[PDB]
Write a protein that holds these residues in place. Sequence first.
Motif, PDB file in Angstrom:
ATOM      1  N   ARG D  57     -62.011   3.504  30.866  1.00 20.58           N
ATOM      2  CA  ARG D  57     -62.174   4.033  32.220  1.00 20.58           C
ATOM      3  C   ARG D  57     -61.581   5.426  32.361  1.00 20.58           C
ATOM      4  N   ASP D  58     -62.453   6.406  32.555  1.00 20.63           N
ATOM      5  CA  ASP D  58     -62.040   7.789  32.748  1.00 20.63           C
ATOM      6  C   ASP D  58     -61.777   8.037  34.229  1.00 20.63           C
ATOM      7  N   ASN D  59     -60.845   8.940  34.510  1.00 22.69           N
ATOM      8  CA  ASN D  59     -60.523   9.295  35.878  1.00 22.69           C
ATOM      9  C   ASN D  59     -60.221   8.087  36.750  1.00 22.69           C
ATOM     10  N   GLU D  60     -59.433   7.165  36.205  1.00 22.34           N
ATOM     11  CA  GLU D  60     -59.041   5.966  36.940  1.00 22.34           C
ATOM     12  C   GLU D  60     -58.161   6.356  38.118  1.00 22.34           C
ATOM     13  N   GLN D 135     -52.672  18.116  30.565  1.00 24.58           N
ATOM     14  CA  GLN D 135     -54.069  18.032  30.153  1.00 24.58           C
ATOM     15  C   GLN D 135     -54.797  16.972  30.967  1.00 24.58           C
ATOM     16  N   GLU D 136     -56.116  17.097  31.014  1.00 21.71           N
ATOM     17  CA  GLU D 136     -56.961  16.108  31.657  1.00 21.71           C
ATOM     18  C   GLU D 136     -57.534  15.218  30.557  1.00 21.71           C
ATOM     19  N   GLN D 137     -57.332  13.905  30.651  1.00 19.46           N
ATOM     20  CA  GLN D 137     -57.880  12.970  29.651  1.00 19.46           C
ATOM     21  C   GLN D 137     -59.334  12.660  29.905  1.00 19.46           C
ATOM     22  N   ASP D 138     -60.136  12.590  28.839  1.00 17.09           N
ATOM     23  CA  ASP D 138     -61.475  11.994  28.923  1.00 17.09           C
ATOM     24  C   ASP D 138     -61.588  10.710  28.109  1.00 17.09           C
ATOM     25  N   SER D 139     -60.526  10.374  27.382  1.00 20.59           N
ATOM     26  CA  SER D 139     -60.429   9.098  26.698  1.00 20.59           C
ATOM     27  C   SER D 139     -59.108   8.426  27.052  1.00 20.59           C
TER      28      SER D 139
END
Lengths: 204, 204, 204, 204, 204
Positions: D57-60, D135-139
Amino acid sequence: HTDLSGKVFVFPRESVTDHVNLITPLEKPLQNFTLCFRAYSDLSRAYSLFSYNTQGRDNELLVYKERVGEYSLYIGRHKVTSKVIEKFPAPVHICVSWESSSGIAEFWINGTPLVKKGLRQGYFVEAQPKIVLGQEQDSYGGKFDRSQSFVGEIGDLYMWDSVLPPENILSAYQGTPLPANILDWQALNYEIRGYVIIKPLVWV
Amino acid sequence: HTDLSGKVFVFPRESVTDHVNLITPLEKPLQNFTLCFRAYSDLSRAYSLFSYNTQGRDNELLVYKERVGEYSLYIGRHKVTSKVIEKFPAPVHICVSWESSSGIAEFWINGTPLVKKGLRQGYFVEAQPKIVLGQEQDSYGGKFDRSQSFVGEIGDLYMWDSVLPPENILSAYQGTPLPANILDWQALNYEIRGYVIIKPLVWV
Amino acid sequence: HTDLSGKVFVFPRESVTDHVNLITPLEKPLQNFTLCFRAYSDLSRAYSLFSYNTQGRDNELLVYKERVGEYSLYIGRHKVTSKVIEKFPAPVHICVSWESSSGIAEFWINGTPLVKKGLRQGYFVEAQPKIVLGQEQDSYGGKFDRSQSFVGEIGDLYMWDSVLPPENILSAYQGTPLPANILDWQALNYEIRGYVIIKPLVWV
Amino acid sequence: HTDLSGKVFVFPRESVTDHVNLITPLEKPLQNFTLCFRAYSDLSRAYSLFSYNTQGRDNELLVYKERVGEYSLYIGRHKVTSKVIEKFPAPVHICVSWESSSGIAEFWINGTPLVKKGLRQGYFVEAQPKIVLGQEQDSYGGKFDRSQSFVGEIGDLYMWDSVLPPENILSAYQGTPLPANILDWQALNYEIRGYVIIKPLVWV
Amino acid sequence: HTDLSGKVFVFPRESVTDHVNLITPLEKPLQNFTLCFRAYSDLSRAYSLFSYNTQGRDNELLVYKERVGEYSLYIGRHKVTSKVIEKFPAPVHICVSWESSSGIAEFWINGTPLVKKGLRQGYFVEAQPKIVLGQEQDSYGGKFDRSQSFVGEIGDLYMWDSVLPPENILSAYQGTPLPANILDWQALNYEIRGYVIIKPLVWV
Ligand SMILES: *[C@@H]1O[C@@H](CO)[C@@H](O)[C@@H](O)[C@@H]1NC(C)=O
Ligand SMILES: *[C@@H]1O[C@@H](CO)[C@@H](O)[C@@H](O)[C@@H]1NC(C)=O
Ligand SMILES: *[C@@H]1O[C@@H](CO)[C@@H](O)[C@@H](O)[C@@H]1NC(C)=O
Ligand SMILES: *[C@H]1O[C@@H](CO)[C@@H](O)[C@@H](O)[C@@H]1NC(C)=O
Ligand SMILES: *[C@H]1O[C@@H](CO)[C@@H](O)[C@@H](O)[C@@H]1NC(C)=O
Ligand SMILES: [Ca+2]
Ligand SMILES: [Ca+2]
Ligand SMILES: [Ca+2]
Ligand SMILES: [Ca+2]
Ligand SMILES: [Ca+2]
Ligand SMILES: [Ca+2]
Ligand SMILES: [Ca+2]
Ligand SMILES: [Ca+2]
Ligand SMILES: [Ca+2]
Ligand SMILES: [Ca+2]
């Protein structure tokens, strides 16, 4: 003949019809004058604030707002314009005087003097005028132009046959004008034509 | 009826579904009214603040925000618009009154009067309205338009069947309004439809 | 001569003619000087504030306003320009000094120092000028240019044959200048040419 | 595990590598939360302030700044954005809360409430997160994007499993935060990866 | 060897010639430093404030102003830039520190901290510098560029071989700097080249 203390004329819409005629028994040509009034408008286009024409003479005495921050006085068709920093929209108190002997025109905006300009030295403003609020005259009493109409509110209008000194302009700005002998908001002879409504002044 | 003192309706998203119906037993046509409320929205597009339609009549009484700094009132489909200096985004308090006998509409924004405008002099606003917050009606109670939806918060809504004088407008602005006989936030009869949430008012 | 305390020259219209000649009896080349005066103009175009030419020498000492927020000094045809934050239109008090030994020019605007610049180190400003307010000279006393004319008001002009320290500059700004030996507003030898009117100073 | 009172993480350059992992033993999905922290950055491009992802789930839960004056909250990939007047560059204090029962998200910027928005009513934010600053996660824990990296300073970070009322938000802003049960600056369990430097907080 | 308290260097014109060499007893590479000084310029184009080059190494330590609101520090040819809200033109007080161990560069502008940035962690700034005010060096002591020349005034310059805490920065800003062991305005060894004039500081 009517005391408009605490009241304004509301010109509530754009039109070529709506106006007030101001009546003064002015039989002798004017060598000196001061005119003060308050106005509140959210028009951005050009408009006339005070239109004074005489027989055969257009723009004999005209106070005209070209655009935000710029006030013009016409004397016998000739004009001067002075600039000011002002918020928009905002109520404003305007005084303008002119003196034939020097030709000097003095605008005061919210009790602040603009740069003096000069025109028509030696000239006498003609008598027997038709004086109109709400529309700009192109004839003796008429020939209005919708694109020059004033929409908004005008109050506290006085006119003197002399040049007011700074402290008297300040007194008018503060709501205590010295006795006025040409036009007097506290004993004003006028004619409403078309859609003009008298209301309390709520923005001073 | 519910006392919403200290609370707001939150319209938390753009939609064509979310709205509040305001219920008033208004049986006789309105000659005069004043409507006050507080709103907080960060929409830049146009939106309806207060939509009042009657059978067969669109925009019978509509308060509409065209864009930042510009407020419109519709009376029987006719409109006027007045401008104001405002920050964006920012909470606002709005009062608007209208008086049939003169046609005069007065907007007050954060206790400051806008320029008066005039419309529908002599008209009577029809009775038996459907009154909607959150959406703009094009039918009697419906035909909403997503691009006119209100997103944000509204509170302290009051409507009187008279024109409030400045002192009463300021009282409303300050949070001590006079009792209101058409709609009153402290005794409000309403219906929530879709996604509207009642929350405490935290921004006054 | 004439004590102009509390008065200004008004240059009420744009022209290639209207000007004031200022006459100094102190006849010597200048190694050091300071010039202070007040001005109020709503021109946006370029204009001359103070024009000092000598026989066969243009722009011998010239204070020139190219545009809003920018003041220029010419010494012997060379120029420097310094910038300042200023409202427009607004009255201004200007002081400028120059010192041959260093070449340093100091502008002070409303008692605030601009960045120092430098020009003509070792040069002597020539004696026997024609000094003109209201027009920019291109000859000895003439060859004016309407597009460089000054429209507006000038007052409280003083010129000293030394470089004033900050405390003296502040004194001038505040209205208590040290007596001046080249030009002095309280004992000024001047000649009005064309349309220039003396009026009270109402903006300071 | 570490008391960071009076200190910030400095992310001193743009990268795809530099980040801080925040460790919390969060096993119960979240129905309510509030997150507060201070940040100081002079980036104009978009950037992630707080990135919370769960397995698959990205951007949870994501707090993201798309541009000056606009703050976004993501819950389960869905997003809301609210606007504010802010200077640039400038230190900021940010609080955001979200309440499942209503879906309401409240941003508070320097102790001022933004317009409420709503999303994911009835949803529960998934537990067992990876939480990343810088950082922004995508995983789950990675797939960063330097065009979304945070360059600048972050301090005074707290996360509670409840929706803070205004008094508690203001207390955090003024530097008296309630002890926090998910993340707490006085007892923060973190892992620095790459170029992140701990320094005293000198700006607020 | 000269106490320049209360004085500035004036670089009164644009040139490729005018500069000041600053002389310091520095044979050891720098791991930590802080540099403070006051400057007043109305240049809009880019310019060098403080240029420190070593043999075969350009931009070894350089403080450079690319445009209004942006300050750059170069360490060993690498650069960081941080932004600030500032008026133009306006006197400014600038401090910058750099710490090899962390690579952190701190800018303070008028006693306000900018966002920290980082570069050259672990690097030693080379010794035996040529230090120049007024021009940007592209060689060891020369290869100036008129388009990078500093025009205006610089004073109160101090350089320490340590990273100053905020209290010491504020002291320098306020006019009570700590004694400084690399360069000290109150005991300065310098060489004027070309057109540079020492004048009292009148703008603090
Ligand atoms: C008007 O102007 C003044 C001079 O300032 C007088 O000359 C006055 O006589 C003027 N004219 C009048 C009163 O009619
Ligand atoms: C509304 O307007 C006022 C005029 O000020 C009155 O005429 C009032 O009677 C009007 N109408 C009603 C129903 O109150
Ligand atoms: C002008 O400058 C002063 C002080 O700076 C003296 O040096 C003075 O002699 C200078 N020149 C004069 C008066 O001719
Ligand atoms: C959480 O949010 C609060 C509101 O402040 C309550 O609605 C609370 O019941 C909510 N639910 C939980 C699990 O605490
Ligand atoms: C800076 O670098 C060296 C040499 O001065 C040490 O003194 C070091 O401690 C300095 N400061 C720090 C905190 O790194
Ligand atoms: Ca006309
Ligand atoms: Ca006309
Ligand atoms: Ca409609
Ligand atoms: Ca519609
Ligand atoms: Ca010339
Ligand atoms: Ca010329
Ligand atoms: Ca993502
Ligand atoms: Ca991403
Ligand atoms: Ca270089
Ligand atoms: Ca170079």
